[PDB]
């Protein structure tokens, strides 16, 4: 149950990190923008798919991004109800503008994170967890089953120096500033809370 779960990045794939991390060392807060763009792209996809597929939205009828800081656990979560990724996509998918050009903006998460977890659910596959420290990565079936319904959560284990991204004022100011790639609603969990009115619509 390891040779089918533990993998390592391609030599070009690992080299691409050396470009992203070294180049954007002064603009670390670009990561939220990049993650939010991907969420919007994945929302565009399932929305386009839903034009031709009347069952496309069955597992989650909502088209949103929801951001929530878990300061107690040192975690930042970015959750979209987009197209999601299959296991095959999680396994095989491997300068502020150039990052968005070649599609590698996702790995700007490692400017602020020691470890990135991706939980995704695609309509044609079970829910899976991908995790990496940017040296190796693994992909496993999610033991919690289908909790997302459809879409993708990006979970960031923040570095000690990135503590500020667990703060509500910081993440809210960043989301408003980087509402570049969103014509879908973006919410921030505005609580540390019990109800659905605890989401603040950011855009
Ligand atoms: C070929 C296809 C799978 N690539 C499109 C972008 C992949 N992707 C991305 S970027 C990404 C995500 C990864 C990844 C590499 C990238 I680049 O390895 C672990 O999870 N974010 C997405 C999201 N929120 N929803 C759906 N798909 C997402
Ligand atoms: Ca299905």
Number of C-beta neighbours around residue 200 at 10 A: 15
How far, in Å, is the centroid of ligand 1 from the Cα of 194?
31
CATH of the domain spanning 7-203: 3.30.565.10
Alpha helices, DSSP H only, in the chain?
11-23, 30-52, 87-92, 96-102, 168-177
How far apart CA 91 and CA 171 sit, in angstroms, is 30
Alpha helices, DSSP H only, in 82-189?
87-92, 96-102, 168-177
Per-residue burial over 27-65, b if 16 or more Cβ lie within 10 Å, else e, is ebbbbbbbbbbbbbebbbebbeebeeeeebbebbeebbb
Cα dihedral 57→60→61→62 (10° resolution):
-120
Resolution in A: 1.7
Could you tell me if 156 and 73 are in contact, meaning their C-beta atoms sit under 8 angstroms apart? Answer: no
> Which residues belong to the annotated binding site for ATP?
38, 80, 93, 106
Ligand 1 proximity of 90 Cβ (cutoff 6 Å): yes
CB-based burial of residue 12 (10 Å sphere; 0-12 exposed, 13-18 middle, 19+ buried)? exposed
For residue 15 the two structure tokens come to 């080299």
Radius of gyration from C-alpha coordinates of the chain: 16
How far apart CA 27 and CA 171 sit, in angstroms, is 15
User: How was this one solved?
Assistant: X-ray
> Which residues belong to the annotated binding site?
38, 80, 93, 106
How far apart CA 56 and CA 123 sit, in angstroms, is 7
Domain range annotation of the chain? 7-203
Ligand 1 proximity of 93 Cβ (cutoff 6 Å): yes
For residue 85 the two structure tokens come to 């990724």
β-pairing verdict for 136-141 and 6-8: antiparallel
- For the CA of 99, the nearest ligand: 1
Q: What percent helix, strand, coil does the chain show, rounded to 5?
A: 40, 25, 35
How far, in Å, is the centroid of ligand 2 from the Cα of 65?
21
- Residue nearest ligand 1's atom 12 by CA: 106
Ligand 1 proximity of 34 Cβ (cutoff 6 Å): no
Three-point CA angle 9, 10, 16, nearest 5°: 90
Given the structure tokens 């839903």, which residue do they identify?
Answer: 50
How far apart CA 59 and CA 36 sit, in angstroms, is 21
């Amino acid at each position: 149950r390891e040779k089918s779960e533990k993998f390592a990045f391609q030599a070009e794939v690992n080299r691409m990190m050396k470009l992203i991390i070294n180049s954007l060392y002064k603009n670390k807060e670009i990561f939220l923008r990049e993650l939010i763009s991907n969420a919007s792209d994945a929302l565009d996809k399932i929305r386009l798919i839903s034009l031709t597929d009347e069952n496309a939205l069955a597992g989650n009828e909502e088209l949103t991004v929801k951001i929530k800081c878990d300061k107690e656990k040192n975690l930042l979560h970015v959750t979209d109800t987009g197209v999601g990724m299959t296991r095959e996509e999680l396994v095989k998918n491997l300068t502020s503008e150039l990052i968005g050009q070649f599609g590698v903006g996702f790995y700007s998460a490692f400017l602020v994170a020691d470890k990135v977890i991706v939980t995704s659910k695609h309509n044609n596959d079970t829910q899976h967890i991908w995790e990496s420290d940017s040296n190796e990565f693994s992909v496993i079936a999610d033991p919690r089953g289908n909790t997302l319904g459809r879409g993708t959560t990006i979970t960031l284990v923040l570095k000690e120096e990135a503590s500020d991204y667990l703060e509500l004022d910081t993440i809210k100011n960043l989301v408003k500033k980087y509402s570049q790639f969103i014509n879908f609603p973006i919410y921030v969990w505005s609580s540390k809370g019990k109800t659905v009115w605890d989401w603040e619509l950011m855009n």
